[PDB]
Amino acid sequence: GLYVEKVSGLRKDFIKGVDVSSIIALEESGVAFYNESGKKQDIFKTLKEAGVNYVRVRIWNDPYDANGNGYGGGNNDLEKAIQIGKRATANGMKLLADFHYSDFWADPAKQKAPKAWANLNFEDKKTALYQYTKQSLKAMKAAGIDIGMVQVGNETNGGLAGETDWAKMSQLFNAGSQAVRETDSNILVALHFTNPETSGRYAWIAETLHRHHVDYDVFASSYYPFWHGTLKNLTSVLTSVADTYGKKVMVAETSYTYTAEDGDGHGNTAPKNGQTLNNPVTVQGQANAVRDVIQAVSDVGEAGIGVFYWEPAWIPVGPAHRLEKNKALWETYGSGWATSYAAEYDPEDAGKWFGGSAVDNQALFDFKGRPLPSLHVFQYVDTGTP
């Protein structure tokens, strides 16, 4: 049934990644994944056959309260990162370590310093950040994980580790970069930003990064069609950065809704009134969207290295009608986007929105763990559907 129009000019080594950080918590919650045939199968093996060649994983310093209760959102710490990294490498896929440098979600509004760095003077925090990055990468190498890229920060549009001054942020960027550089020259260092639709933003950030001598290789951007403007603009701002600063560029996060139904009982992020939905909310629509982001990045030219689909398997732990029975699992295994336990660290957001998955309707797997036909977009962009 599916239809993918061949992406013209797509390079043969283009990165096709997925971020399945929630996978560990979900498997402990009892969630299972299958394959085309319908037999339980490691999701990392299903991803590999689908043509995925990269795995991104978010890493929070200490996503737990004093007693050890996970903040949820996958409770993604270094330990789960190694778990994910091993499976990713055991399935022939490189890893993208995404350091949030925070104990929980880091985005344009949230860049809270880790509890341990809470009150360290700037000099010590910079050292801690370096040490942390250094130690984490080393532990990963020890596990035999094939690290291809490291993200120093996540959507650091306005801050990083409690810091909001770009002069200080840049020093933190270099601190992390420094660790990567010392770990392996071949690892690509990427900085991640979002909101490309914002007039001049990326151009300003790239210039600022340049003026403060930040050493990085990839200028990464998020791209969620329902908020981040046109694909024409995306290609345009990423090409500027590429040409003007000689950096590689890519989309570190992207997805689309394949259905308007909520599968676990926790209101989803999309689709919503006011959101731009240029593709029908269906499996084909979803495939179209992914296919077009890949095209948009590929159109940048030699600088456009790839695209990472964000959370293609954060499916429900149970049907929406079992909301209460679900809340239990989310709270126990942190398999939802956040647990009540995170209120202490982020009372403003997580504090009053904690629960389950907010993106199950954007997975490339159905609510029951079966892969949707859209999952084959990764393969088809090279040839197209016959």
Ligand X SMILES: OC[C@H]1O[C@@H](O[C@@H]2[C@H](O)[C@@H](O)[C@H](O[C@@H]3[C@H](O)[C@@H](O)[C@H](O)O[C@@H]3CO)O[C@@H]2CO)[C@H](O)[C@@H](O)[C@H]1O
Ligand Y SMILES: OC[C@H]1O[C@@H](O[C@@H]2[C@H](O)[C@@H](O)[C@H](O)O[C@@H]2CO)[C@H](O)[C@@H](O)[C@H]1O
The catalytic residues are 155, 253
Residue whose pair of structure tokens reads 């904690």 in the numeric block: 354
Alpha-carbon span 304 to 220, nearest angstrom: 10
Which of 9, 92, 267, 347 contacts ligand X by CB under 6 A? 267
Is position 269 an interface residue for ligand X (rule: CB under 6 A)? yes
The site for ligand Y (CB under 6 A) is made up of 107-109, 155, 194-195, 222, 224, 227
Is the CB of 4 or the CB of 251 nearer to ligand Y?
251
Peptide bond into 347 cis (omega under 30): no
Residue 337 interacts with ligand X (CB under 6 A)? yes
Question: Which is closer to ligand X, CB of 4 or CB of 20?
Answer: 20
Q: Single out the segment in contact with ligand X by CB under 6 A; choices: 126-134, 265-273, 281-289, 374-382.
A: 265-273
Residue 353 binds what, of ligand X, ligand Y, Ca ion, none (CB under 5 to 8 Å, by partner type)?
A: ligand X
CB-nearer residue toward ligand X: 79 or 348: 348
Q: How many CA atoms lie within 13 A of 48 on its CB side?
A: 14
User: In this structure, is the dihedral angle defined by the CA atoms of residues 111, 66, 57 and 329, taken in order, positive or negative?
Assistant: negative
| Token code pair at residue 76 | 């993604």
Residue closer to ligand Y, measured from CB, 198 or 208: 198
Residues touching ligand X: how many (CB under 6 A)? 10
User: How many angstroms separate the CA atoms of 95 and 357, rounded?
Assistant: 24
- Tell me if 366 contacts Ca ion by CB under 5 A: no
Q: Which does 337 bind (CB under 5 to 8 A by kind): ligand Y, Ca ion, ligand X, none?
A: ligand X
Q: Does residue 264 touch Ca ion according to CB under 5 A?
A: yes
Q: In angstroms, what is the minimal distance from the CB of 378 to ligand Y?
A: 21
Judged by the rule CB under 6 A, the positions of this chain that interact with ligand X are 105, 107, 266-267, 269, 337, 349, 353, 358-359
